[PDB]
Amino acid sequence: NMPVRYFIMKSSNLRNLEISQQKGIWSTTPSNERKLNRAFWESSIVYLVFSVQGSGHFQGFSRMSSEIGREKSAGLGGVFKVEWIRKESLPFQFAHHLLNPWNDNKKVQISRDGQELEPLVGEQLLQLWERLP
């Protein structure tokens, strides 16, 4: 199906993003492990766009590089590989015009953790980083 899907990932604080950016890993809730995996196999590329909660920035975006091994068998459970593409902060003002038809046409800036972006609008969301060096 969909050759590219996009998802918003929220962080509780910026240190976690700093860990992800340097170690190249992420981990998320289980509600979202099932969603992200089925997306990993179906789509050619899954993009994760990041935002610390209540920070007023997206802190960059990454591609999802592995699956979320939840072997039947805490303890680095549910950690997966991410490949950051852009690590520069983008204020919400640059995206205010961008609306998510899959989230009640609300602004993409208003997304729960793991919210999938409609592909056209995900695509433009990524093009805004080209403004930033």
In Å, how far are 9, 22, 72, 76, 99 from 115, measured between CA atoms?
A: 7, 24, 26, 24, 13
Binding-site annotation: residue ranges for RNA? 10-12, 26
Q: Which residues pair with 7 in a beta bridge?
A: 48, 116
Domain count, the chain: 1
Q: Phi-psi bin for 60: left (phi > 0), alpha (psi -120 to 50), beta?
A: left
Binding-site annotation: residue ranges? 10-12, 26
- CA angle, 30 then 62 then 76, to 5°: 40
Q: Are 45 and 63 spatial neighbours (Cβ–Cβ below 8 Å)?
A: yes
- What resolution in angstroms, rounded to 1 decimal? 2.6
- Beta carbons within 8 Å of 97's beta carbon, 6+ residues apart: none
| Burial group, residue 25, by CB count within 10 angstroms (0-12, 13-18, 19+) | middle
Q: Where in the sequence is the domain holding 31, given as residue range(s)?
A: 4-131
Q: Are 68 and 36 spatial neighbours (Cβ–Cβ below 8 Å)?
A: yes
CA–CA separation, 20 and 69 (whole Å): 17
Q: Are 11 and 113 spatial neighbours (Cβ–Cβ below 8 Å)?
A: no
The CATH number of residue 66's host domain is: 3.10.590.10
Q: Are 102 and 117 spatial neighbours (Cβ–Cβ below 8 Å)?
A: yes
